[PDB]
Amino acid sequence: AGRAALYKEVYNVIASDGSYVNYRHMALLVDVMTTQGGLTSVTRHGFNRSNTGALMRCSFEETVEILFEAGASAELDDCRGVSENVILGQMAPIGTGAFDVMIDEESLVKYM
Amino acid sequence: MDQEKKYGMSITETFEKPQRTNTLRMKHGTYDKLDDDGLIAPGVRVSGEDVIIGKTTPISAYHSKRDASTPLRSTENGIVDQVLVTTNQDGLKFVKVRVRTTKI
Amino acid sequence: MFFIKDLSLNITLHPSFFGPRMKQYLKTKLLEEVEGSCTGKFGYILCVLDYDNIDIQRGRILPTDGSAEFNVKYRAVVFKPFKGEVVDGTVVSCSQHGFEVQVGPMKVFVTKHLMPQDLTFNAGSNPPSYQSSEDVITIKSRIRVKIEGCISQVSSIHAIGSIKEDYLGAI
Amino acid sequence: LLLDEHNELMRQALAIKDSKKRFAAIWTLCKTKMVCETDVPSEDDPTQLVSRGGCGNTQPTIRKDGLKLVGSWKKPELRVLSTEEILNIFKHISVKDFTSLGFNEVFSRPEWMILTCLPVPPPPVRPSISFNESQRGEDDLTFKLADILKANISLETLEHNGAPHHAIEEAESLLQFHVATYMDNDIAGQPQALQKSGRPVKSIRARLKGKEGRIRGNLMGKRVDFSARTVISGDPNLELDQVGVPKSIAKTLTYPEVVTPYNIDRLTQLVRNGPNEHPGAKYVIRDSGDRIDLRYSKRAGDIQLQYGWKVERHIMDNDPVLFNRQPSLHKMSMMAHRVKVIPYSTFRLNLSVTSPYNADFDGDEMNLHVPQSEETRAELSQL
Amino acid sequence: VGVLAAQSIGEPATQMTLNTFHFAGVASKKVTSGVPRLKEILNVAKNMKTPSLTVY
Amino acid sequence: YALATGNWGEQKKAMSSRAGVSQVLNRYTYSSTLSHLRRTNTPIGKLAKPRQLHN
Amino acid sequence: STSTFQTRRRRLKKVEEEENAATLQLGQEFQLKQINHQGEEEELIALNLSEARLVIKEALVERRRAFKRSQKKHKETREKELESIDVLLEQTTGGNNKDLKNTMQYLTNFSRFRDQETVGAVIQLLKSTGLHPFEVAQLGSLACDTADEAKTLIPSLNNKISDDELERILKELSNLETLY
Amino acid sequence: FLKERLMEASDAFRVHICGICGLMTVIAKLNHNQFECKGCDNKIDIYQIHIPYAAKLLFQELMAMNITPRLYTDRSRDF
Amino acid sequence: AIPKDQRATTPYMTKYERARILGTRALQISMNAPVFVDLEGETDPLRIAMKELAEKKIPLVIRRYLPDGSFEDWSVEELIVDL
DNA sequence: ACTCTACCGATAAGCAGACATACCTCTCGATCCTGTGC
RNA sequence: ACAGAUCGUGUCCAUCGAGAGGU
DNA sequence: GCACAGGTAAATGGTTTGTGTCTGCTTATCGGTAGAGT
Ligand SMILES: [Mg+2]
Ligand SMILES: [Zn+2]
Ligand SMILES: [Zn+2]
């Protein structure tokens, strides 16, 4: 019910300028904001305090605090996000990088 | 603008046309338009990285002098109209040059 | 001492060679690669047995260029000089520092400080060796030598030998 | 630990998988306790007690004052807690205790938070600023490291030659302050560090703190090559997907093309043209680098292009390039157009693409990016 | 889809005009709407400027 | 120093002193010079009231 | 080039339990219950001096036969043994193959069993005990006269084998090596 | 395109990282074709990675901050 | 972890997959890889890649990674191209 | 039955921490010395 | 025994603050 | 003849129009039962 109320509030917010936004975007936003059992604010005290990678988290808010926290702990960054791959300069597993391309010998000998 | 600033006592820059014989790490711009005093006479067309003021500073193998010339701007060109030479408060040399261009 | 292990090798193939003969190309690549290798982890690779069902997996293409990385699976005979292991070889060289042994393809050194003072360097005899009592040892003669440890893990692989042990020398 | 598994509340708290939440729960439950117990009643049969095995000494109220920790020992004594005794206590912590607290016995032990051996960055981290006229201007990090070394030497000499406890205390306080300012120059409740120039010193935390930092200004955002920017303009005669590139921009920007039997003649013609006309080339790349310049060597024409080389030709027609306007709010602000060389120094675009760009022709500035590989070119064209 | 949703929500926010006043119907209650309302919704403010309630 | 750097104060403690008090004269156009010679600034630093045109 | 993935905190184990020892303590790569490419839980294979020579010889002749058949489809004692593997190696492996000559020469010179039936029955005889295959290979390769030589040769057989059984299969191996 | 813009059209660096420590403190001598890690006397597992120079500078600064950003080329899961 | 009879992924070929395949084929052709189709006098590697994709003569395999870590292999010639 | 005082929970109210669209263009200054030396 | 003038390629002048700008 | 090296200055007292909106820590304040009688 809280998620539905939040979606209705957002839809009412984008109602006066005349702009129309597809339901999928706002639904995704409110689902992200209510993934846990309560409201998750879009700020340093909301979605930030999560279990995601430290490198991807520390690129928006203050950085050295979370770096010190990571050093004090021993959490592992899976490097499956976009920010980590951008920092490491590798092809992020998004869009064209969501799959792998391999060559097969059977098809290679099939054509010729 | 340029100045004949002095380091210590004997390390004083001088205004002269630099030569390949005793100048190291010098700029690759043309020095043909320069004169003996190190300044371009008014009425000479300049363009690109051409050197307008020739200044060299003593190093302290030879190469006792190192260039400090200021070239013209990469995107600017024109004809020099007025060159001003005078002295600053302490007594060194003060040199000012001007470039005139028409923008259609 | 001889072991056979299911080793793995990673190779990169240029796409200009992407023809029907890629399988045999990789086969000869592996063949000349692991033959005579001196890897410090596995040891000495002598022969590549089981030239069948190599099972060349699909070659992932690197995003940078058109090359493909292949992970070939194979088994081969390995040779590593395990420390503290008694082996038998033949004498090849004998300087004043000591007499070497020819256990396998290695150059195990029996330094003078290892075997007892009984062995003396007698240069009067035509083959320079360590002629002494308790049996005769010479160049190209049977000798059993123990291994103290492994050194120089990079580049060539060899060890150091000793004779000071009951029922170890002569034979 | 102050509390163990005997307590029901402690047992409930020691169940969270998250390290931060578990540590917070442990701290909240143990901050109330102020004395070792050594005799904890069992969960069953509360009449009989079980010897915990502690020391029985009371605990102080640790309070943070600047860069030092003070403890109000009340059974009130006010003794400043030295770093040595805290480190010794940390070294005596059992593995399970800080494993439950959140610390890892392999990667980050609790006792490693105390600085006993400070590494120095290499010269690449703190380069030398040449600066106009021959003067060796140095980075603030080098000056801070020299200050730390001087403080350490002074403390060592003062300890060795014999001195009152006040001198040792002030020397160690100065060393701690200098180290902290080297690592963080924005300490709350402490005076900032100033050099001879009078400006605040630059710390690595200040080096990476905002959008000019190493991460928000040099990792997710950086300057790039093979890009251009010039005033845009309208052209009704252009196609919907087409951008008017000035001849100078085309002659400056280059695209590396691998020589192939299908384009050997074209590449040879472009090389013979030289980096003067628009349909020309600027560089020729042979095997293992070894770049060849076509404007200084002048050896063009008598050079034969072998297979596998790379030629940096100028941007020609129908070349897919990226066209961008700032600010980039939606994905429509980034589009791929086809290069059309025009004889004027301005950007020309179709009038129908201005709406997604949200741009007009009153002095707007827009950026152009060119690809450098077949992967990027094809994906830009098809996506 | 997350980046697309974020852009599709943020673009009208920039494209909106002033949204500080004029949001009054029959009764001039000065109901908060527009950019400040969106900001307080995103921040999940515990004390909104103009709390309201509807009863049927 | 005060008339050159524009920081009204001594050489030290320039961070805590005001900035922009002294500015180089704008001589692009006579009207620009006249406007620059009759300019006032209120040091404020989020607030719409001080920026509004009062009666 | 590896066959085992990281386990038991291989990143920062910080134990450094030496590198090798005579009393078992084999290397991590040569550990018991190895991992096969398709199977699992397979023990390490240990080859004697005679077994290894037969294995390499059979692999070489198989490769030579395969190469000869491909070409066709496209179109004494110790002294005699040296010529055989010389002519086998001169065309099968190819390349420099300098290291292969010394290994084969050492295998031929120090070979203990030359009969296929005897080497085949060696494993059947030795399978009675549950000893680690490394030490059984050591006793099969190295010569012996009684229990004292076997006990002194390696330190991995302390009270692990009864003396009566030890002397029994030592004499068994003695006759099995003196018959050929 | 993002990877090309971030790496090829900008800073691009190659470093050697020890497979045990996970740090970039590896002594590499390309003339003699040998590598060594003095931290754990490792010589038979050295990997090379392509990262931007800014990332290398950030990692070096973090190491100067007594924080170890160990980098590994394999995924740690199960056992 | 490569099921075949339990492949629940869509049989169609996505836009990202099409772009990646076309780019890889074009790059390989540009760096002088063998071509399995006649060119009709064409000289641009990208259009040659499109021509090869038209008749499904590209010897490549798409490995679609499931979020858990499993994957299934789809051949290019068996993927339906409709966009 | 609730006095003589202890920990449980539940708030008020003061003390600090983080930060504010994106893109580029140009000019202009400053980066130490005074008490102390024979 | 042997046992050199420079030559030939040469890398840039940076940082910190302040102000004025324009989409 | 001129250079050479440490941070010895202010003590003070002192400052500035109009930055909110959460966040966490540290007290102060308010009910409520338990060690038992005439
Ligand atoms: Mg405009
Ligand atoms: Zn205690
Ligand atoms: Zn290491």
Curated annotation (Swiss-Prot), chain B:
The lineage of its organism: Eukaryota, Fungi, Dikarya, Ascomycota, Saccharomycotina. Disulfide bonds: none annotated. The modification Phosphoserine is found at S60. DNA-dependent RNA polymerase catalyzes the transcription of DNA into RNA using the four ribonucleoside triphosphates as substrates. Second largest component of RNA polymerases II which synthesizes mRNA precursors and many functional non-coding RNAs. Proposed to contribute to the polymerase catalytic activity and forms the polymerase active center together with the largest subunit. Pol II is the central component of the basal RNA polymerase II transcription machinery. The gene is RPB2. Belongs to the RNA polymerase beta chain family. The binding of ribonucleoside triphosphate to the RNA polymerase II transcribing complex probably involves a two-step mechanism. The initial binding seems to occur at the entry (E) site and involves a magnesium ion coordinated by three conserved aspartate residues of the two largest RNA Pol II subunits. Component of the RNA polymerase II (Pol II) complex consisting of 12 subunits. This is DNA-directed RNA polymerase II subunit RPB2. It is found in: Nucleus.
From Swiss-Prot, chain C:
The keyword Membrane does not apply. Keywords: Cytoplasm, DNA-directed RNA polymerase, Nucleus, Transcription. Signal peptide: none annotated. Transmembrane segments: none annotated. Gene3D superfamilies: Nucleic acid-binding proteins (2.40.50.140), RNA polymerase Rpb7-like, N-terminal domain (3.30.1490.120). Its main location: nucleus. SUPFAM superfamilies: N-terminal, heterodimerisation domain of RBP7 (RpoE), Nucleic acid-binding proteins. GO terms for cellular component: cytoplasm; nucleus; P-body; RNA polymerase II, core complex; RPB4-RPB7 complex. It comes from the Eukaryota. InterPro entries: NA-bd_OB-fold, RNA_pol_Rpb7-like_N_sf, Rpb7-like, Rpb7-like_N, S1_domain. The keyword Nucleus applies. GO terms for biological process: DNA-templated transcription initiation; nuclear-transcribed mRNA catabolic process; nuclear-transcribed mRNA catabolic process, deadenylation-dependent decay; positive regulation of nuclear-transcribed mRNA poly(A) tail shortening; positive regulation of translational initiation; RNA-templated transcription; transcription by RNA polymerase II; transcription elongation by RNA polymerase II. One of its GO terms (molecular function) is translation initiation factor binding. Belongs to the eukaryotic RPB7/RPC8 RNA polymerase subunit family. Present with 6420 molecules/cell in log phase SD medium. Component of the RNA polymerase II (Pol II) complex consisting of 12 subunits. RPB4 and RPB7 form a subcomplex that protrudes from the 10-subunit Pol II core complex. The RPB4-RPB7 subcomplex probably associates with TFG1. Interacts with NRD1 and PAT1. The gene is RPB7.
From Swiss-Prot, chain D:
The tandem 7 residues repeats in the C-terminal domain (CTD) can be highly phosphorylated. The phosphorylation activates Pol II. Phosphorylation occurs mainly at residues 'Ser-2' and 'Ser-5' of the heptapeptide repeat. The phosphorylated form of Pol II appears to carry, on average, one phosphate per repeat. The phosphorylation state is believed to result from the balanced action of site-specific CTD kinases and phosphatases, and a 'CTD code' that specifies the position of Pol II within the transcription cycle has been proposed. Zn(2+) 2 binds at C36, C55. It is found in: Nucleus. Residues 185-202 are annotated as: Rudder loop. GO terms for biological process: RNA-templated transcription; transcription by RNA polymerase II; transcription elongation by RNA polymerase II; transcription initiation at RNA polymerase II promoter; translesion synthesis. GO terms for cellular component: cytoplasmic stress granule; mitochondrion; nucleus; RNA polymerase II, core complex. Its main location: nucleus. One of its GO terms (molecular function) is DNA binding. Mg(2+) 1 binds at D360, D362, D364. Mg(2+) 2 binds at D360, D362. Residues 127-139 are annotated as: Lid loop. The keyword Amino-acid biosynthesis does not apply. Keywords: DNA-binding, DNA-directed RNA polymerase, Isopeptide bond, Magnesium, Metal-binding, Nucleotidyltransferase, Nucleus, Phosphoprotein, Repeat, Transcription, Transferase, Ubl conjugation, Zinc. The C-terminal domain (CTD) serves as a platform for assembly of factors that regulate transcription initiation, elongation, termination and mRNA processing. The chain holds residues 113 to 504 of 1733 of the full protein.
From Swiss-Prot, chain G:
SUPFAM superfamilies: HRDC-like. One of its GO terms (molecular function) is translation initiation factor binding. Its main location: nucleus. It comes from the Eukaryota. GO terms for cellular component: cytoplasm; nucleus; P-body; RNA polymerase II, core complex; RPB4-RPB7 complex. Residues 1-20 are annotated as: Disordered. GO terms for biological process: DNA-templated transcription initiation; mRNA processing; nuclear-transcribed mRNA catabolic process, deadenylation-dependent decay; positive regulation of translational initiation; RNA-templated transcription; transcription by RNA polymerase II; transcription elongation by RNA polymerase II; transcription initiation at RNA polymerase II promoter. Keywords: Acetylation, Cytoplasm, DNA-directed RNA polymerase, mRNA processing, Nucleus, Phosphoprotein, Transcription. Signal peptide: none annotated. Residues 68-75 have a biased composition (Basic residues). It is found in: Nucleus; Cytoplasm; Cytoplasm, P-body. Belongs to the eukaryotic RPB4 RNA polymerase subunit family. DNA-dependent RNA polymerase catalyzes the transcription of DNA into RNA using the four ribonucleoside triphosphates as substrates. Component of RNA polymerase II which synthesizes mRNA precursors and many functional non-coding RNAs. Pol II is the central component of the basal RNA polymerase II transcription machinery. It is composed of mobile elements that move relative to each other. RPB4 is part of a subcomplex with RPB7 that binds to a pocket formed by RPB1, RPB2 and RPB6 at the base of the clamp element.
